[PDB]
C-alpha cells in the first residue's frame, strides 16, 4: 500500500462479517479454511516464483519467458496504468492445487487477499508508481464447467467459468456506494458507505443534534456501474433432450460495455443464487432461488475460431 | 450556588429600561437574564459548565410590596413582592425538567423536552416507528429539578379589623427549596402565575382560576 485508495469490488458482492474461528482448543474464516495470512503468503509466493515450463513464445507475447510471468505483468501494469492483473487459474492449479481449490470454492474471501498480496508486491517494487486505485486480481480459466445446468446448489457462491454467446446487454445501472447525507437545519454533511448492501442513515445530526434531519442527497453520492448481460450458454456437454440455456450475468464498473451482442465469450465469475420477491411491492421471497453469474473476467480468446 | 442575586435598585439605577420591563414580562426577562448570566459565568470560569449549566437570576428589593389581600387579576403575569408566614411546606419533590421518553413499541428514546411549569409535555409520534402510541418517562435518562410547594398567609399583625388572613400557594424550584420552614416569616418575590391547569372546567361552579406564585426570590426575616 502507498496510500492509494482501495476500490470496492461489487463483483465480489456485499462484504460479510469476516468472522474468524480457531480450529483448536488454525485461525480459519468461519465456514471456510482460507487463513487469510497463509493464503496471502502463498499467493505472493506464486506471483513471485511461477514459471510456466511448457509455455510458448507464440502463446506469451511481449513477456520474457524465463522471468516470472506475473512480475512481468506487474511491470506492464506500472508502465500502462490499468490496475487490473489477469491471473490464470490453471497456473494457480499447477503451482499449488490447494490454493486453486480455495480460490475456486471461496472467491469472495480469497480474492481480496490476492489483491492485498499483489498490491504489497507492486508497491514494495515500483514504489513511486501512481494509480487511480489499488490493483484488482481477476482469475480466469477455471476448470471449465461443461454444462451450466449440471451445477448443484452446493456449487453456489463460488468461481466458475462458462462459454456462451452474448444475446443482450442492458443499459448502465448506477449502483450506490457512499450515501451523502446533509442536515436540513444546519447543513452539516456526512457520508455513509455501503455496509453489507445497506446504508445506515444518520438518524441524528452530529452538528446540531437534531433527530431525523439528515436527508440523503442522491446526486452528491458515490456510485458504481452495473450491467446485465443476457448470455445464451454454449455448452459442449449436451445430454439428450436438453434445450439451449440462457443465463444472466452482471458486470461491475470496468467490464461494463466490454462485450457486445453476438460476441462469443468465456466468462469467469461467481455463481450466485438470489431470492426473488413474490411481488415488486412486498418483501416475501419464494423458497426457490434464481441463479446468475457475477462476472470477474471476460475472455474473448478461443482456439477454434478466428480473432 | 447556581443563583446570582441582582439588586433591583442597582438594575434600575444603571439600566432603567430593563428595570421597567422586568415587572411587566418577568418570564422572558428572567430567561434572558439567566442566559446572559450563564454566558458571563462561563467566560469567567469556563470550567463551571460541568457544575450547573444554568444560572438563576434572583431579583431583590423590588420597590412595591403587595400584601396577599391586595392581589387581583391586574397583577397577573407580573413580578410582585409580598410578605407572609409559611403555614405549610411540602417535601422536596423531583419535578421533570428535561424529560426523555421511552417509546414502548420499539424502545426508542425520544429526546429531551423542556418540562414547562404550565402544561404537561406530551410527545407526539416516535421519530423511528412514528407510533403515537403509549410513551413512558425514562427516569434514568431524565433530569429533574427539585420542586417544593409552600403556603404563605398574611401575618396576623398585618391582618386588621375583623378580616381573615388570606393565604397563597408558592412554588420553589431547585434553589429556593428548603429556604423556608413552616412558621417562618418571609418576603417572597415571584410571578403571579395564572395559567397552568386550574380553571375549574369541571362545571363544579363558576369559571375561576386557581392562581399560584412562582417564587423568584425568598428573603427570611430574622
Amino acid at each position: 500500500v502507498r496510500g492509494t485508495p482501495v476500490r470496492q469490488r461489487p463483483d465480489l458482492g456485499s462484504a460479510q462479517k469476516g468472522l474468524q474461528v480457531d480450529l483448536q482448543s488454525k485461525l480459519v474464516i468461519w465456514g471456510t479454511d482460507v487463513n487469510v495470512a497463509a493464503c496471502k503468503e502463498n499467493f505472493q509466493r506464486f506471483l513471485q516464483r511461477f514459471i510456466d515450463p511448457l509455455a510458448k513464445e507464440e502463446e506469451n507475447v511481449g513477456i520474457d519467458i524465463t522471468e516470472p510471468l506475473y512480475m512481468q505483468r506487474l511491470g506492464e501494469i506500472n508502465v500502462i496504468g490499468e490496475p487490473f492483473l489477469n491471473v490464470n487459474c490453471e497456473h494457480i492449479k499447477s503451482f499449488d492445487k490447494n490454493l486453486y481449490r480455495q480460490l475456486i470454492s471461496y472467491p469472495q474471501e480469497v480474492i481480496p487477499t490476492f489483491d492485498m498480496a499483489v498490491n504489497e508486491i507492486f508497491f514494495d517494487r515500483y514504489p513511486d508508481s501512481i494509480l487511480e486505485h489499488q490493483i484488482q486480481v481477476r482469475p480466469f480459466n477455471a476448470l471449465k464447467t461443461k454444462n451450466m445446468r449440471n451445477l448443484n446448489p452446493e456449487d453456489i457462491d463460488q468461481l466458475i467459468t462458462i462459454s456462451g454467446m452474448v444475446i443482450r446487454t442492458s443499459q448502465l445501472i448506477p449502483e450506490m456506494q457512499e450515501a451523502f447525507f446533509q442536515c436540513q437545519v444546519c447543513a452539516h454533511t456526512t457520508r455513509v458507505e455501503m455496509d453489507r448492501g445497506r446504508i445506515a442513515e444518520p438518524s441524528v445530526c452530529g452538528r446540531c443534534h437534531t433527530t431525523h434531519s439528515m436527508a440523503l442527497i442522491h446526486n452528491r453520492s458515490l456510485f458504481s456501474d452495473k450491467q446485465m448481460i443476457k448470455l445464451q450458454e454454449s455448452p459442449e456437454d449436451m445430454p439428450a433432450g436438453q434445450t439451449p440455456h440462457t443465463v444472466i450475468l452482471f458486470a461491475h464498473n470496468d467490464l461494463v460495455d466490454k462485450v457486445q451482442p453476438g460476441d462469443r465469450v468465456n466468462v469467469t465469475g461467481i455463481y450466485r443464487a438470489v431470492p426473488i420477491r413474490v411481488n415488486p411491492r412486498v418483501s416475501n421471497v419464494k423458497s426457490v432461488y434464481k441463479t446468475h453469474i457475477d462476472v470477474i473476467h471476460y475472455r474473448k480468446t478461443d482456439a477454434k475460431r478466428l480473432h | 450556588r447556581e443563583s446570582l442575586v441582582v439588586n433591583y435598585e442597582d438594575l434600575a439605577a444603571r439600566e432603567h429600561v430593563l428595570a421597567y420591563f422586568l415587572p411587566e414580562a418577568p418570564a422572558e426577562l428572567l430567561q434572558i437574564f439567566d442566559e446572559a448570566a450563564l454566558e458571563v459565568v462561563l467566560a469567567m470560569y469556563p470550567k463551571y459548565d460541568r457544575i450547573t449549566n444554568h444560572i438563576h437570576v434572583r431579583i431583590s428589593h423590588l420597590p412595591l410590596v403587595e400584601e396577599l389581600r391586595s392581589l387581583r387579576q391586574l397583577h397577573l403575569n407580573q413580578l410582585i413582592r409580598t410578605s407572609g408566614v409559611v403555614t405549610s411546606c411540602t417535601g422536596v419533590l423531583p419535578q421533570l425538567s428535561m424529560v426523555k421518553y421511552n417509546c414502548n413499541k420499539c424502545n426508542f428514546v425520544l429526546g429531551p423536552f423542556c418540562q414547562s411549569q404550565n402544561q404537561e409535555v406530551k410527545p407526539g409520534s416516535c421519530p423511528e416507528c412514528q407510533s403515537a402510541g403509549p410513551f413512558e418517562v425514562n427516569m434514568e435518562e431524565t433530569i429533574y429539578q427539585n420542586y417544593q410547594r409552600i403556603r404563605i398567609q398574611e401575618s396576623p399583625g398585618k391582618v386588621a379589623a375583623g378580616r381573615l388572613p388570606r393565604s397563597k400557594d408558592a412554588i420553589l424550584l431547585a434553589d429556593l427549596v428548603d429556604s423556608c420552614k413552616p412558621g417562618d416569616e418571609i418576603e417572597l418575590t415571584g410571578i403571579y402565575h395564572n395559567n397552568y391547569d386550574g380553571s375549574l372546567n369541571t362545571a363544579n361552579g363558576f369559571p375561576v382560576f386557581a392562581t399560584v406564585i412562582l417564587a423568584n426570590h425568598v428573603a427570611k426575616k430574622d
Binding site: 448502465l172 448506477p174 449502483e175 442536515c183 436540513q184 444546519c186 447543513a187 452539516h188 454533511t189 452538528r207 437534531t210 433527530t211 431525523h212 434531519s213 439528515m214 436527508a215 442527497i217 442522491h218 446526486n219 452528491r220 456510485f223 458504481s224 456501474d225 464498473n253 461494463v256 460495455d257 | 425520544l110 429526546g111 423536552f113 409535555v121 406530551k122 410527545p123 407526539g124 409520534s125 416516535c126 421519530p127 412514528q130
Partner: protein, 191 residues
C-alpha cells in the same frame, strides 16, 4: 450555524467577478449587456461560454466542470445578485446559468457513473419530447399534527416531503400538506 459550503461560495464569488469584469474584444462588459435582457419576463436564463470562463479563470472553470452539480445553485444565486444590483427584477424571480461551447464532448456509452454530477456535453438524436409541465423545486409544507410550516424543502427529482417536522416535540414524518401557493415551480420538459 448553517455550515458553509466554502468551495461553492468561493466559486460563486469568482463567477460573479467573472460576470462583472469579463469583457469581449470591444472591451465592454458582454455579460452585462446580456443580463440587460434578463429583466424582461419569460426570460430567466443567461448563456455563458465555457471558453470565456476558462480564459478568464482556468481554476474557476475547472472547479465548475468537476463540481458542477453542487456549485450550480451558487452560480445561479451569483447571477441573481448580478442582475439585481443592476436592475429591478422581481424579488421572487429565479435565474439560471446555461453553459455552451464546452470543449470536450462525451458519448452516451461513456456517460458512466463517474460522470455523475459534473459538467458534460453529449450528442443525441431526439426521439420524442413530452409537454411542458410546471415542476416542484421547493415546496412549503404544513404539518397535519401541529400546523407547523416547514418552509423551503428541496425536491430531488421526486416528490420529497420534509424528513421530520420542525417542532422538536412532534415526530410527524407522514402527514404533511403541500402549500402550492407558497411553493416555487420551474418549467420542465422530458425528452
Amino acid at each position: 450555524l448553517e455550515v458553509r459550503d466554502e468551495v461553492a461560495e468561493k466559486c460563486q464569488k469568482l463567477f460573479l467577478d467573472f460576470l462583472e469584469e469579463f469583457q469581449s474584444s470591444d472591451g465592454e462588459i458582454k455579460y452585462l449587456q446580456l443580463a440587460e435582457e434578463l429583466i424582461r419576463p419569460e426570460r430567466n436564463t443567461l448563456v455563458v461560454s465555457f471558453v470565456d470562463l476558462e480564459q478568464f479563470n482556468q481554476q474557476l472553470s475547472t472547479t465548475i466542470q468537476e463540481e458542477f452539480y453542487r456549485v450550480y445553485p451558487y452560480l445561479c444565486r451569483a447571477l441573481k445578485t448580478f442582475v439585481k444590483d443592476r436592475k429591478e427584477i422581481p424579488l421572487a424571480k429565479d435565474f439560471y446559468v446555461a453553459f455552451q461551447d464546452l470543449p470536450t464532448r462525451h458519448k452516451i456509452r461513456e456517460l458512466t457513473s463517474s460522470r455523475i454530477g459534473l459538467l458534460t456535453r453529449i450528442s443525441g438524436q431526439v426521439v420524442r419530447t413530452h409537454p411542458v409541465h410546471p415542476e416542484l423545486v421547493s415546496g412549503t409544507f404544513l404539518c397535519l399534527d401541529c400546523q407547523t410550516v416547514i418552509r423551503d424543502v428541496e425536491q430531488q427529482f421526486k416528490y420529497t416531503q420534509p424528513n421530520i417536522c420542525r417542532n422538536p416535540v412532534c415526530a410527524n414524518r407522514r402527514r404533511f400538506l403541500l402549500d402550492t401557493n407558497k411553493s416555487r415551480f420551474v418549467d420542465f420538459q422530458k425528452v
